[PDB]
Every structure is written in structure tokens, then in C-alpha cells.
Amino acid sequence: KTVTPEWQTVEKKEQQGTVTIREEKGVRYNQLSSTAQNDNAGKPALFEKKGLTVDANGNATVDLTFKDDSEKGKSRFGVFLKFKDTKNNVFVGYDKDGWFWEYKSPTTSTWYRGSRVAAPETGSTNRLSITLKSDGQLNASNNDVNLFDTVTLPAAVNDHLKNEKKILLKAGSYDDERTVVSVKTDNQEETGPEVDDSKVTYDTIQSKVLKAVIDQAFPRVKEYSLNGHTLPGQVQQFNQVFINNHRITPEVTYKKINETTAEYLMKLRDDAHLINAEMTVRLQVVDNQLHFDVTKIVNHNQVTPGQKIDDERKLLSSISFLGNALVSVSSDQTGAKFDGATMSNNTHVSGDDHIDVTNPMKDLAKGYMYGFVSTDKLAAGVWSNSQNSYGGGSNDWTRLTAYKETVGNANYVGIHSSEWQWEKAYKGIVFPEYTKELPSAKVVITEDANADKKVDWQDGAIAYRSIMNNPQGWKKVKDITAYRIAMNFGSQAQNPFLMTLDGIKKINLHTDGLGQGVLLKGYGSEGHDSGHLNYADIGKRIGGVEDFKTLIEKAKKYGAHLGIHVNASETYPESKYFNEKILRKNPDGSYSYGWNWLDQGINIDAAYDLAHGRLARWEDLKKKLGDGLDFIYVDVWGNGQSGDNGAWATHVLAKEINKQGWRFAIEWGHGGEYDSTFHHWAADLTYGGYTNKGINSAITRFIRNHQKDAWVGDYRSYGGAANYPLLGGYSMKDFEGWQGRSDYNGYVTNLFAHDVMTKYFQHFTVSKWENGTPVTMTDNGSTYKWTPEMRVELVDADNNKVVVTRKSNDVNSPQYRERTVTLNGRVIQDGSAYLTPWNWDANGKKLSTDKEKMYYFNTQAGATTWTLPSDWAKSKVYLYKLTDQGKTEEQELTVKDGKITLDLLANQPYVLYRSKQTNPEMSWSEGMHIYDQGFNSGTLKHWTISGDASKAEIVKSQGANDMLRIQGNKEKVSLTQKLTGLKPNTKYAVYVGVDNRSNAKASITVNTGEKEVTTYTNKSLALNYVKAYAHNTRRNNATVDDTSYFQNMYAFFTTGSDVSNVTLTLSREAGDEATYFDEIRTFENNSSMYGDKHDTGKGTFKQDFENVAQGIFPFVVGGVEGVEDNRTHLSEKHDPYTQRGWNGKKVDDVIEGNWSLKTNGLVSRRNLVYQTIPQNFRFEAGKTYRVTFEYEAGSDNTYAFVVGKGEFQSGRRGTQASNLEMHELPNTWTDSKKAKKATFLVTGAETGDTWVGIYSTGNASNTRGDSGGNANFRGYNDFMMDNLQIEEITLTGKMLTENALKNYLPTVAMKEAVFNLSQADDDISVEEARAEIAKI
Ligand SMILES: [Ca+2]
Ligand SMILES: [Ca+2]
Ligand code: NA
């Protein structure tokens, strides 16, 4: 008997309730109760379970079954996640009035308005799921009912609770009322009507191999028979359908077209429900398949896609043959069994049902995705194109429904097609024709199909592949081994298109031609989460359409497939397609705001969007890009931001995308089961926790493992299916920016550790799946039982046979986590090492004999011996070490009676070949006008060095990222290349990224043949805080000593008519310390900032922001939010939406022209938002300048103009905030219709060291009674700059007193000292000036 509670009250004396163990009905519980000495505010009864705690990766999951034992309407229950205290937490729970979320923190505390799901009824049983992630993405469901739309915690709120690991249940009291809930513990230790065929007239259609007995009155199969064996269809007559969810007995006329084909015309009429249609069903046998097809529908009501309709009831919306089993099995038959699959993304809970059809037996009426019935002799499987959904979770994608039906002494289980869809409409407007897809289902019948001398669901599964749908593009999945995100954000152009080609080339070498998948996140507009919906708006700062086309063409040669990250759920005002009609509104007419980051977005009504030309937008992208693109990754879709993102809506989206020739990929793992080939939740193992991963179904994975990356990969933490799956499963990493990750070594290692074998298996189809003994595990706050897979067999078109076997059934054994793989009887993997053949090129084509190869990888040291196949056995054999320079350290191995022994470096890939091989010339950085732009070629030979060439060399950053370094040179060292492929008489920009730790001059110089422009830096003084950038200052990316001061150094120039002798020169003067360079980028640019001219030179400096090459030049982003997707960027005009007045917006996004420099929401941070650095603009020693700009600010004194010098807050004297010269700026709308103008006099410190910038003060903003998105959208918390001008002048005392006057007047309008300033002597000295101004 159990005396041990799974739950206990917390230790805080006053937050204590009463835990008690209670065993009632079948089940055991722990009853949590509140007491008299509790309340619902500071001192509620809190409870706590060992293990239940935010996971290593910062995701909180709760999956709690319970029942409410409180008096009806008297309960206040919920879960606290990431709990710090009563006023610092996230909460999901209910009260009288239903389910809500709520969060509390200094910055922001609110809860859920908007209609709630009703609270649980007393005693009813509740399966609660809650997820809070690292994104701050909160979702919850109760008994598979979504409780609310996804909420994302704001940056401020999430950052504060990021570290909190507490997960508590709350039970609150109020006066006499108490909360009492019983949580379900982990530990818990026939007749029916007979048939009457007397009036039925049957018929038979038959192929060579399959015969089906069919009714002449209604399209139903009585039985099938293959090779004398039988399976029933629908034994009892049911001559009724459901149209628009209404029961209707059709008027049917029948006609047999030929021996294989019969068809029925079916009239459907119900005046009371405005039904008046006819349809033609066709039943056809082909080989061993029965095809059920509605071949024609006619709605006699008048309906026209695109046109509005007066009464949605006149549409023929849904057709249901539910009640007619397409195939079934009888408990009278031997081996009677049904097996089905339902959606599960919980690594602990399989989604599969395995039911013996017996009499007696349990009720069965359930939706399924895949379904099979089998006897001892035959198996059948059913397919349907139904996009029915019975609900969320396991009720979704339920294209089949299985039913128990008692007929006489027999229990039948039959598989029916779920409801079909047809004419649908949104707010009266009928959807486009292409949304309609004629209903269709198929049955396949099979004898043994995997030669194990028994007939079960697996035999159905094998047969099922010839009737099922297949995700468009699925054939490519096998050979995409290296997926990766290349990211751009905030006008920064972190990963230009042509530059991505270098990374493709790099991986090509290190993997010896394995296939790649690069997802361009921020390909459009300014980057990621900018200009959503305008899919055709390829981003100009990363190379425009021209470069994106080049990237696609040249990537083919390396098996690099490209995709783009899009969003069909949300848009920002900047966008072209942004417009009030497309926006989503709540019942009360307020906007459904999306997330606030660069700008505050607004959700869109996807239904409206579909009804109003969304297809046009895909076709524009296609017209713009042309052929070449592989896939489209649709972010967000699934979270209900944009409304209905169900099976039906998702199918329609996928068809739009597919129709352009593109593959479909989604974020959601629940999502797009019918069409997707890639799910981020499945692929990125460390994200969302154990309940948000891939499809946990042996049946589904059996069927489709080779077609998509959608499965449960290896992640020991998550347990269950995730504890070393035998088929592996794609595990993703990256090094080109995503989530601040730019470490290259770990990318390749992971690739061989997990993905090579995962992809090997995808070159075969599963044919046998054998499970072992149930085993007990304990993780993520529970103890649960799990049946692992023990043996999987796969097969090939050419009869090759792979056999994967787990080396132990014992979960405590380490060999539980080990497998052996045999190819045709021969061992290719055992435990930590494998030696796999790989006989396919990057694009999956068969490699020619002479190019066939094997890969070796071993996660430990130690010798391993391998038997060679017959065609390698009597041969020479060469081992190569694979590095970022390709094949290295060639080594002839010794073969000994068909065996070789490898004793090599652990976690290092090697490739074996039958003959000597060489690496090819990569043509690095091609199209970028320079060779090896990022120093990946292992050599500086291409550079003309001048000086002591030993003082320059390529070195690796702390992120394994190659860089040029010059150091310890006692004389000038310089490296020169000629710029290639330039256009005559054309304006250009070039930058090299530079991080200079020496005071010595580090310079970039272009010489056009007609002119020479130069730009230089001394010791760098600005840390790099751009999260998506390779050389930001995170440890894993730091240059050296855990810091990075990398910033782009520019030179602007113009070619003359002769381009044959344009050279670029990086150089460094004498110094001991190091300068590091990386990433030389040269590109067309039409700015003119230097005395109204383009070329770098003397003259007044002006930035109107209209022709910025990249970034926020001459500023660089500061440390105000640490290394981050910085919330300062170039904002784009789209009038009226981005300007004053629209939706109550208080300030302009763009002050003049089409572009301005916008900061969003960074108020009250006490830190530098951005600053100049000397290499972008140098305030020269002793000279005085007049800095001038126009600006908008939505609150008084939230942002300030600052003059500083040296490295800000570097711990050196006077680099502190106090010591900056600071000018707080007032708001620009309360008393003005346009941006105000600022003027400052700045004199360069003698250390050549000075800079100016914008600082976020400690003052609070003033949102004028607004809040939420309204507050964000309207710019109370924003700051915009435009029309910068810096101009050298002659400092004089008078000059100072005049500028002071202008700066002190605004105070005077709400004195005598200031009047006296205005009549200061024309020749006041700078001293007396400062004297007087100080006294004001
Ligand atoms: Ca079999
Ligand atoms: Ca402008
Ligand atoms: Na923007």
C-alpha cells in the first residue's frame, strides 16, 4: 500500500495547503487542498513535485491529468511556471469564469481578456498541457481544446524570468471557498442486429488479382477477395450520407462501365437545409487496389468562387460517407486485428493503437491518420484525401475514422473515410476554385509483403505506399544531409547571398560532397521579421535578385538546395501588402497585434487573405526568382495567430506553394502532416521540450521515414522514443547566425554523429519493425513505461537489405543506446563507430564506380575492424582525413583477408576511396570581386604581400572562424589583390571587417588607377553586439580573449572607364599587438556623403540614410540589449501606415525620403543605443565640428544625445556613463507636427578617440494611457533620426554662446541670464563663453 505522496506543499509556512493520498474508482490520486489560512493573492496554497522543473534548455512543460473536487463554481486553480514569487511568475489556470493566462513582473503585468473556455465540471477528468519555452511562447490545452491563442512574453518579462526553474500548482482560497483538486498519480500499482441481403442486388468488379462484391443501390463493398481469401467491407447496409452535416438518403442510379469499374449517380435533396446537388461516385479495381472516387459534383444552388454568397448554407461544404466502412475485419476471423496511428509529439506517449478485434471488446469510435486491418491471411490499408479534423492533438489530421460495429455474434472493426470538404466561404466570399479537391479514397489488400511468414499491419504499410499521397519534393530529403539557417536582420546584411556560396563550398569540402539545405531567414526586405507578406521583395542590402539567382544556380554544383523563410500570419506597416482590409481584428473591433520587436506587427486574417488573392503573392515571387528554389519554410503557421491554420487551411497553403514548384516545410511538428517534408520542432532537438518534438508513431515513421524529416531524433533527456531511436532522426545545428550560434566545428561533428546515418536509412524503405519489452523510465517530472523498438529492417529497389538492431533491451545498460547496422549481412555500424558506403553524389545520383566511397566516424578512440565487401576486398584502399580544406593526409591502408583496421582520431570524419583522389579548385568568393573574401582557402598566396610576410597569417577565432591576423611587425606590412569583374564608371563601396587590438594604423585602401581612397582605424573601441553576425562578442564567436570589437571599415570609390587595374590593400603599420580582418565585401553603392560626393574624402559629412550599403553607418549598434537581434534599424516609408496619424501613431517612422534610422522601444535601459566609431567618422584631435540631425521621439527625455571618447564602460577612468556629455531630447509631437532639429558642437579629444551617439536614459516613458500593442505601435517608446550632418568649423567663444542660446530657449517657453547670452561680445573667449554657459 502506498503511503508516499508524489506531491508536497512548499516550505513557505503561509503558502501551505494540504496534500493527501486518495484511491478512488480504479485510479489513485493526490488531493491538493487549500485551507482557511490561505488566500488567492500573496499566500495561496502552492504544491510541488520532484522532477517537475524547467528543463536544461529553458522550456517549462506540464502535462497533468486531474479532476476538480471543489464545490461547483468555487475553485481557483492553476499552474505557475518559471516562478520567482507571488508577483513574479507566469500562470495558467481557471476560476468561475473559465481558463486564463497571467504574468507578473516589474515592467509588465497583465492577463488574458477575450472569451475563455469554460471551467471544468465537478468530478470530470482533465488532461492539461502547458508549454512555456525559451522564446516566452506560452500555449495551453485542456482535453485537447486550445485554451487561448499563443502568447509570447515581452523581452523584458522573459529576460527577468529566464533563469527561474520552479513549477508549482496553486490552489487558492477566498472567504469560506476552497480549491480542492485531485491530481492523477504516476504510480498506479455481445449481440447485435443480423444482416439481411434478401433485397440487396450485388455485383462484382474485379482485376486480375482483386475481386470486390459491390451493392447496386449504393457505393459500398460487401467484401474483397484476393487469392481466395476474404476481408469484409461494410456488411450492414447504410444507404445514407451526410451533406453539410445533415443526414440524407440519396436517390441512386447505377451502371457497370466495365469489369473493373462501376459508377453511381447520386442525387441529394433537402429543402429544409437548402441542399440540392448531385454527385457521381466511381468504384474501380486496379491490381490490388480499390479506388473510391467522387468524380463529379454539381450544386444546383448558384455559387461562384470569388463572388459573395447570400447564405453559406447554399454551399455544398462537406460530404461524408461516414457509416460505410471501406474495409473491415470480423472477430470471427483468425488473427483479427486493427492498428492505427494518431498525432503525438510527446516523446513519452506513442500515438499508435494496436487492438485485437474480439468479442467481447472495448468500444471504438476514433479518428486516425493511418489505419490498417488484418487477418492471418490478408492485410488492408486505407488512404483518403480528407482534410477532416475532429479537434486538436490526437484528434487532428484524422482522415480516417475507425468504428466497432456488432453484427450478430461478430464484432467488426472497419475503417471509414472521414468527412470531405468542398465549397467553402469566409464572411460570405466563396474561396477560389483551386481550394476544391474532388473526394478520393483508396484501399489496398495484400498477402505477406515482407517475407516473415505472417500478415499484419506492416504488410499493409508496405502496400500502402502505392496508394498514399506523397509530400511534393520528398525524393530530395534523402540527400539533404546538412540543413542550416543563413540569417539576416535589421538592415545589417550579416549573410550576403554570394557570401553564403562560400559556406556551401566550405561544407562541400569538409563533407566530401554531401548534400546541403540552406534556409535563408531574412532573404527579403531588411531581414528576418521585416516586410512580411511581400515575398517578392528580395533584399537589396544582401545583393538583390541578381545575387539570389546566382546563389541558386551555382549552389546546384555542390548539391546545395535553397529555401526561404516566409510568414503568412503577420505583417508590419512597412510592407507593400500591408493594408487595413487584410488585418485581423478581435470581436470588439480592436486589432489582433502580433509581436513587437523591430516594429509592432499586426496579425492578418489568413481566411480573408486566401479569399482575396494570396496566390498572386506566390506567383510574383516565382516570376521574380525563376526556377531553382527548392523549398518554402512557413514560420508561425499553426499557432492560430492568423486564425484557422488547420488541416484544410494548411493543405490549401501547401498547394499554393507546391504549385510554384516548391517543397513545403513548417515550424510546427503537429503541423502540415499531409504535405510537409521538414519540421523545425523535429529537427532542432533542443527546443520546446519533450512534448513538442516529432511524430511519435512507429506506424507513421514505418510508412514515411524516407520522405521527410519529421521524427523523434536522439535526445536522451526527453526519454521515450527520444532515447536513441534506431532510425536516428535529423538533428540540426548551424554556424551562419541563427540564435547567436556561429560555431563551425560542432556543426560538422554533429552532422556525422547523427545525420549521416539518419540519411543513409532514408535511401531505403522500412519493411520490418520489431519491438521489445516495456521498460520504465523517469524524466521531465514523470515516471512512465515505454516499449522500445529493437529491430528495424529496411529495403531497396535493388534488393539490398539493411538491418538495424539495438544491442540491449535494458534501459540501465549503456548498450540500450547502441546499435549494430548490417548492409546485406555485413556490419557497417556497431556502437560508436560506423563505416558506411555512400554511393550517391551531392544531388543523390549514383556515383560512378571509381568514385564510390565509405565514411568512417567514431565518437571514441580505439581500433575497429571492418569486413570489406567483395568489390573492395581485393583492392587498394586509401584513407583521407576530412577537414575544412577537404581530403588530407592520404594514407594507404592494409587489407587482410578482406578486412581493414582503423585506429583514428575520435570525432573526426574520414573518407575511404578505392583509388587516389584530389580536392578541386573551389573558385572562392566568385562574383564578389576578390578571391577568398573570408580567408577559407588555407593560403595567402593570392595576395601580394609587402613587408615581412611572416607577420601575416590566417588564424581561427574562438568560433573556428578563419581570419587574417597581422602582429609583431616592426615595419609596415600590407597585402594587395586586384578587384575583379568591376563595372566601368560605377560607384562602389567596399568594407573589410576589422578588430584592431593595437594602436598602430590598420587601413583599407582602394586605388582605381585614377585615384586612391583610404580609411583607417587605430585601436578598436566598440564591441560588436549584432547577434546574427559571425564576429559578435559572444564567447562562442569572440575574436580572442572572449571579446570581439569587429566592425566594418569602409572605403567608397568610383571606377573610371578602365577596370583592369583596380587594387585593394589591407595594411598595418608597426605594432606589437594584433589586428584581425575578415570578410571583404565590395558592392555597388549610390551614396554621396562627402561634400555631396560618393568617394571617401574631405567635405561636409551627410547621411540621409537613403543609400546605406549595410548597417546603420556611420553608427554601430551599442550594448543597450547585449548581443541581440538589435532593435535599431533602417525604417522604410509606406505612407500613411508608417507615418503620423495612422492607427493613432504619434511620430513618423521616416522623417525625410524613404529611409530613416529607427530605434524601437529601448526606453529606460541606461545604456548606449548606438555610437560612431573613428573608422566610420573621426572627430579629429583638436578640431571642432557641428553635429546636426532631425529626430522624432515619443516621450520627453527617454533618449539622449551623448558625446563620449574611448571604449564606453571599459573600466578605464572616465569611460563611465556619468562622464559622457549628455543632452536629453524632448518629445517631438506634443507641440510640433514634424521632427524637431538638434545642433551640437563637438571637439575631438587629442587621443583621436571621440565619438557621438544616442543613449537610453533611466527616465520612464509616457504612453499617455495607452498600453499593449497600441502603446508599442504609436511610438511613445521610439526614437527616429534622419539627415545627419557633421561639419568642421572654427571654434570661437561667440559660436559657443549662440549654440547655447538655441539649446536653452526651448526651456524658456513655459531668462535674464539667457538674454545676456544673446548679446555676448562678438569676441568672447572660449573660456568666458564656457564660463557663462556653465552658469546658465
Ligand atoms: Ca509480414
Ligand atoms: Ca531619409
Ligand atoms: Na522596419
Swiss-Prot record:
Membrane topology: Peptidoglycan-anchor
UniProt binding sites for substrate: 529
Transmembrane segments: none
General function of this protein: Involved in the breakdown of mucin-type O-linked glycans. Specifically removes the T-antigen disaccharide (Gal-beta-1,3-GalNAc-alpha) from extracellular host glycoproteins. Representative of a broadly important class of virulence factors.
The keyword Secreted belongs to this UniProt entry's keyword annotation: yes
Extra information: The hydrolysis reaction catalyzed by SpGH101 proceeds with retention of the anomeric configuration.
Principal location listed in the UniProt entry: secreted
Effect seen on changing residue 635 to A: Loss of activity
Keywords assigned by UniProt, alphabetized: Calcium, Cell wall, Glycosidase, Hydrolase, Metal-binding, Peptidoglycan-anchor, Secreted, Signal, Virulence
Protein name: Endo-alpha-N-acetylgalactosaminidase
Effect on the protein of changing residue 529 to A: Large decrease in substrate affinity
GO function terms (MF aspect): carbohydrate binding; endo-alpha-N-acetylgalactosaminidase activity; metal ion binding
EC category: hydrolase
Biased composition (Basic and acidic residues): 9-19
Effect of residue 667 to A/Q: Loss of activity
GO cellular component: extracellular region
